[PDB]
Design a protein around this ligand. Structure first.
Ligand SMILES: [Cl-]
Ligand SMILES: [Cl-]
Ligand SMILES: [Cl-]
Ligand SMILES: [Cl-]
Ligand SMILES: [Mg+2]
Ligand SMILES: [Mg+2]
Ligand SMILES: [Mg+2]
Ligand SMILES: [Mg+2]
Ligand SMILES: [Mg+2]
Ligand SMILES: [Mg+2]
Ligand SMILES: [Mg+2]
Ligand SMILES: [Mg+2]
Ligand SMILES: [Mg+2]
Ligand SMILES: [Mg+2]
Ligand SMILES: [Mg+2]
Ligand SMILES: [Mg+2]
Ligand SMILES: [Mg+2]
Ligand SMILES: [Mg+2]
Ligand SMILES: [Mg+2]
Ligand SMILES: [Mg+2]
Ligand SMILES: [Mg+2]
Ligand SMILES: [Mg+2]
Ligand SMILES: [Mg+2]
Ligand SMILES: [Mg+2]
Ligand SMILES: [Mg+2]
Ligand SMILES: [Mg+2]
Ligand SMILES: [Mg+2]
Ligand SMILES: [Mg+2]
Ligand code: NA
Ligand code: NA
Ligand code: NA
Ligand code: NA
Lengths: 64, 64, 64, 64, 64, 64, 64, 64, 64, 64, 64, 64
């Protein structure tokens, strides 16, 4: 059985790096991370000092 | 990094109040709740005494 | 077996009341109404005297 | 010919009132507003003092 | 309030059995499981000895 | 001209059998049933004695 | 309250004429037809003597 | 950079002519119109003397 | 077993004729073409001498 | 690099068997088939002697 | 109230840079740009000297 | 007439490079490649030594 968690990573550099940011966090806390699916992308402008790229991923991990 | 939980709130009054019901529950248990996105709405009729409005939200919270 | 009818309710007050308007009509004519799913919402402005909220629902009822 | 503008209204009270907030703004600036279609709903929590309901609408108006 | 977890069940037999596999896991760990919604189906071929059917479900459970 | 009715069939056995359950009901009442399109699948757990598979189909039939 | 029926019209000439074919049938049987929304289009080739254009419409009519 | 405007053209003749009606209006007012994407089609029946075909297009034009 | 090819037909006349243009090409090369499903429509303006209607179809054909 | 082919399998028994029917055909002709994604399901009724389940899959295979 | 404009940015380097290209243009002309949502991505090949990445964004800005 | 092939490119570096990987393969084998549309993005983690970015594109090419 696989389970997915819905995470939004951030980066000041790129959409790829923002996806990596989410996956890194998943790997900090979860065992057996197997894949991530991009489900949304966007950019925060008017709340931050530098544009911040956001990539939302479903991160799948194997249970047991 | 943000994480989302998928919650369905209920209310006997309105769709807005049903969204609030989910957000209230998230805030009981989670720190740093930042936003909610409505993803579905419906009404339970033939299981309850009074019509029950349901609003399903992805509730986003900041990790750390 | 359940069947659904696709109804658009109207209200001069709210989206919730417009959903109720459709469900009320279903219950006038059908037995065993069990649930409604919101599928669209909108507002009529330039055909009516007062803004009219519209909520479109699939209304499910049990056959037999 | 109709044209649509994509507006997000806000309210501290309800999703219906947030839709009205967008439509009111359209009517301030545009002639012949005829209808609005809800395309998204959400709630701002962690940037404001009170929860703020957001309703995004395509607001249609007749040209000429 | 209901919460959903996003699980992918597997089976060497059928899509129905793969859905059951996810629901079984949810029921091992959660109280008050009430319903599951199928959101995706697929088949793993080139990583396994026998074709493996996958059915992804949102599994809803009642909180409290 | 074809018309479609939106039916949800149920089965304690499988998603295929639940689709058949809806089609059987359509054929009880309608002439010239020609095809069915699956539009949703799910499982009822916390209202029934045994898990109940649901398959929702648009059932098309030829008019005249 | 409005209700919609899901009809597929056919024509050997065009997608527009196929939509008209469905609307014509609705108007044969229903009072107060107000609008139609195109939801699908296709072409039957390998069952007919001439290509047959199909346009599927939700046809809305006012109740009462 | 390209920008899109969301226009609904109308015609008493066809869906193609309704798309043209929107594009014609865009070209009246905008320079460097490059393409249009159909996003919706429908028919107005119960507000007009003759059925009126509507085709909604995103009309893209090049900035500068 | 059926297979589909994803083709975009073009016409200077109409969306229907653009669909036909794709189907004609499929029939030049493939046996047992059975149906086509429209999946997108658009108009090329700023690359051609005359507006060019495009209709994208999945064209299904029977294998063997 | 992976490529996908869009195939509809058929079966008189089940949706799972119809998916298998498509995958079997892919494996007859292609090397390195790795996975299949279900994209549609339906039932043919009014053209065949027995109901025929159809499952449409994108079948992915590795190039080289 | 927020308003969105639908812009397609271009870059010879990356999808991230193409999003930035659109946002830069919005910021040239608009005050109070707050966020951008990616809605499409693609690559122009057969009209340009070098592959050109395109990222389409809804760019939101606060009115007043 | 245009045709599209559905390809998934891979890269250890970025989503942009993964799109390029698919387009490069198309250009190895096909004449008159004109454009690519991104339809999915994801990351393989638990099958490879280094995270592998995947970008799925419909690659369009002109026939004849
Ligand atoms: Cl989710
Ligand atoms: Cl329907
Ligand atoms: Cl838009
Ligand atoms: Cl495809
Ligand atoms: Mg930096
Ligand atoms: Mg998002
Ligand atoms: Mg009360
Ligand atoms: Mg729901
Ligand atoms: Mg009042
Ligand atoms: Mg609607
Ligand atoms: Mg207040
Ligand atoms: Mg939104
Ligand atoms: Mg076995
Ligand atoms: Mg999936
Ligand atoms: Mg049994
Ligand atoms: Mg459903
Ligand atoms: Mg003729
Ligand atoms: Mg269809
Ligand atoms: Mg005329
Ligand atoms: Mg529309
Ligand atoms: Mg001509
Ligand atoms: Mg397209
Ligand atoms: Mg048999
Ligand atoms: Mg299909
Ligand atoms: Mg360069
Ligand atoms: Mg696009
Ligand atoms: Mg490297
Ligand atoms: Mg994918
Ligand atoms: Na989730
Ligand atoms: Na219906
Ligand atoms: Na717009
Ligand atoms: Na394809």
């Amino acid at each position: 059985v696989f389970k997915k968690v819905l995470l939004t990573g951030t980066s000041e550099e790129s959409f790829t790096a923002a996806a990596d940011d989410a996956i890194d966090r998943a790997e900090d806390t979860l065992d057996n991370v197997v894949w991530a699916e991009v489900v949304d992308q966007g950019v925060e402008i008017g709340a931050v000092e530098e544009r911040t790229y956001q990539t939302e991923v479903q991160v799948a991990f194997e249970l047991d």
